[PDB]
């Protein structure tokens, strides 16, 4: 209950890079400001979408501190501190605390198989280093390879210090079961392409990569379902998925960064290798989308 201030719609921040694959600090600050001015409830920093796993610890800390400088006190700040290593995750959690974040988050540690008790002790250690700011468990089985049962999720979200679950799963039976077992839990829908259905199943917010370019649509789905405008929520999700279809074709992170570049938010839209640049044949569609989204506001 006492972490209700974490509920809402938060973009998973992209990390802008310059032409030589170094962090573009000026464009990062502009992206934070852009998201604030979209009216989002918070920002989620250094997650999957932030290309955390092709960055060093010091690079991730640098991003966390910059975003806190632009955003502390204006919107909720959540730091994704997860690494495979518990000690590395603890370092990032202690940094997030120093910089004034409102919460930390960690993906279930991946690549190596760990027992469920090893997962729990990993979260417990990070929570200790977070030094009193709450933890968001981040579940993304498609990418982590970690396949938790409902009963395991129930144990994770009741660990002391856990205040939320980021549920990047398309299983909306499980989403409803989680909500029914935990009526006050902050529960973020993780797959943008099912946002409206995920809210209906029990999520009370979302963390999403595509919110960086069209957060007003997701805020509008929240409002429509609250108002009882079924058709409007469906038409908004329809338009979101037209965009997601295109992003999946071109490559999601780089497509988002390219749209943001055509919106004059990011100076350079590159991802880090091994992500390739966008193919030239997609540029016209991405620029047209940027133009469409700016007009729609």
């Amino acid at each position: 209950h006492m972490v209700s201030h974490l509920r809402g719609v938060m973009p998973a921040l992209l990390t802008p890079f310059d032409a030589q694959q170094n962090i573009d600090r000026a464009s990062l600050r502009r992206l934070v400001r852009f998201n604030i001015e979209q009216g989002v409830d918070g920002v989620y920093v250094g997650g999957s979408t932030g290309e955390a796993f092709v960055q060093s610890l010091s690079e991730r800390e640098e991003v966390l501190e910059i975003v806190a400088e632009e955003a502390k006190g204006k919107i909720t700040l959540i730091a994704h501190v997860g690494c495979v290593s518990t000690a590395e995750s603890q370092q990032l959690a202690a940094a997030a605390k120093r910089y004034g974040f409102d919460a930390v988050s960690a993906v279930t540690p991946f690549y190596y198989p760990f027992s469920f008790e090893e997962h729990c002790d990993h979260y417990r250690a990070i929570i200790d280093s977070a030094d009193g700011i709450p933890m968001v468990v981040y579940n993304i089985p498609a990418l982590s390879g970690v396949k938790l049962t409902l009963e395991q999720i129930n144990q994770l979200v009741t660990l002391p210090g856990v205040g939320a679950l980021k549920q990047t799963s398309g299983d909306l039976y499980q989403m409803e079961q989680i909500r029914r077992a935990h009526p006050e839990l902050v529960l973020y829908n993780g797959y943008d392409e099912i946002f409206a259905s995920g809210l209906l199943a029990g999520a009370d917010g979302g963390i999403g990569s595509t919110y960086n370019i069209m957060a007003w649509r997701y805020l509008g789905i929240v409002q429509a379902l609250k108002e009882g405008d079924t058709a409007k929520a469906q038409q908004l999700q329809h338009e979101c998925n037209k965009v997601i279809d295109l992003l999946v074709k071109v490559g999601v992170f780089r497509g988002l960064k390219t749209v943001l570049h055509y919106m004059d938010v990011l100076s350079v839209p590159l991802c880090r290798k091994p992500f390739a640049p966008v193919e030239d044949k997609f540029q016209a569609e991405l620029k047209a989308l940027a133009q469409q989204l700016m007009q729609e506001r």
Copy 2:
């Protein structure tokens, strides 16, 4: 468009067996009448839920003809004629036509791997034998092992003679994509536990095993979303999933048949071997559920 009369909420009929595992014809007729009096839009006969794959062809034909005798002209009748064999499926389709069914349906043929073109020719052959009544494609990847792409689904639902898709998939991104590509397609949600979310994603009806014991709840979800009562659709789905949780624990088909026996619909609640009987320790819960559901009406 011209098959809009197929849209709606239809139970996947269970096949009642007697104490020696023979078809219980008297209880079958009472179950059909019970479902009609629940106000369903149709019945789906001889599907997975009907234990088709532990019955012979002649047993499946017997069930189809009995149900048509009780139900033709009162509610929509859909015959699931699918087998692995194309010739066996054709036999059941020709029988369904003789008995006056409104549509046929066939699961993607399973066990052996078949090419997509072999799947299409299988449907084409069944459609020919159906002799002018439309086909419902039935997609259930979890059980069939058949993993169709969106583009393959698009080709199946535009085959001449196909009038609907039974989508037993929890991927509600794909449900929305199907709806967006086919705005007039009759699109049945197949997993009862996500019915409200599946409707929101684009389904315009459902075929479900649990509708046999509580169809009014699913009809109520349809109505709530049409009316814009978000919270009511969520609370109905909540109550449905409390029931589905219990059915999954006890075994779904036999749990449904046991509830129906305690509602005085079926004389004997057995499934065919290798399904075991219900464990004694679950009987109290199942009888209490039957009592609850009868009172709720």
Copy 3:
């Protein structure tokens, strides 16, 4: 121990069909005789390869009785009686007993999820109906969807009346574990393409679809490993897999039947729908293979 007479190399018999998809009884008898004259240790009748799951019970019984008429007393006869239904499997087991088979076999029942105890009771019931001839458990997770643990396999192979395991799995760690736990168990390698490696891991024989066209190669691998001719076993497996590569491209069962037709064993090489016929562009390769195999003898 007392079922050592079941060890060896046995083709999974194909079921020949005529031009109208009816059983071709004359070609079936010739195929049995052909396999006997290849020097095989037994024949496995009515399995996956036999297209059991696109045949009726009476058709499967017809095949079992014909093969017993040609082969009883000359080679070991194993009847695959498995269906999803326990009662149907029992009918085929009782028939196999009447016809004088040496063993029965049943695939783990599929499509519907069953508990492990339901699987065990299914085998127990079939064993009872087999009336004293031993059971071969048939494990094929890729097609059945049934994913048994080692401990579950250990319980199945120690059920009273079980005399063998047909292991159609590419996990040769598990093959070795099974052999180490059951030093006397008759253990059939099920994937022809790893036969030599499967024997080395602990199998003491095999049941295979491609043995119908080149059993002498698999018999030769057995002999080579017994003699300590590592290189000869590898070169034989090499040549087998060149053939399997081609069969996978053209479709395995129909490619085998086509090679047999070009060897003058089968009059008509068709599979039942939904299997398509062989594409014309593959006929030259298949006829050349038949010519090669006949010359190699």
Copy 4:
């Protein structure tokens, strides 16, 4: 052909840690010397088994340089330089070159989905930074989540600068297909528990975590198959798998490090968090195994 000096049996080196999870440099040097004195053909440094993915770049470089100091010129040295990031992998490849390694290796980049062309360009970039020492492609689908086709493997192993494939896959049909397509390719079996069968299928060596405690058994399997002693290769693999069964129960890396500690090779047997320590109840078995292995020499 010109990289035949890479063929053979090489332990995947463990990285010893001290009691505070820092690298134990003295125990690392002793472990290298221990493996040299087992008569191995090479050592594979900084791989999965080396706990690379819970170490920083500078820690991985430190390990590479230490091992080269102990081992350059005495045995083949292969540096696993793979990270998700191409630029990080390039840094480690350039370091491996500086330190005098004989080859580099990189796991297919994981977590994020990459196209096959992105994978190829990743290897090309690392090969460039390796500055003339050959690349070992490392395939481990169970952990990487990367599911390459045979045709994709064929393209990777023919990239300029690729001299070997580390095949951590249990699919021995594919192992044979790779060998048949590439008769001169250096092909390492990656799953120790199927080593004998993998050699028979076409591998000409292996890279393995359990070689750190019993390399003579794997060298003995190579010799037995070369000599035509089928039974001896089977009995050696039998004994290896008894050990692997135990290591899987206790946790493989920490069990290996514990056995090595009881052999007086490593001062401290800890893995890095989130790996837990060994449970006390397993210590007796692990110490008995160490005693057994020392006596067997």
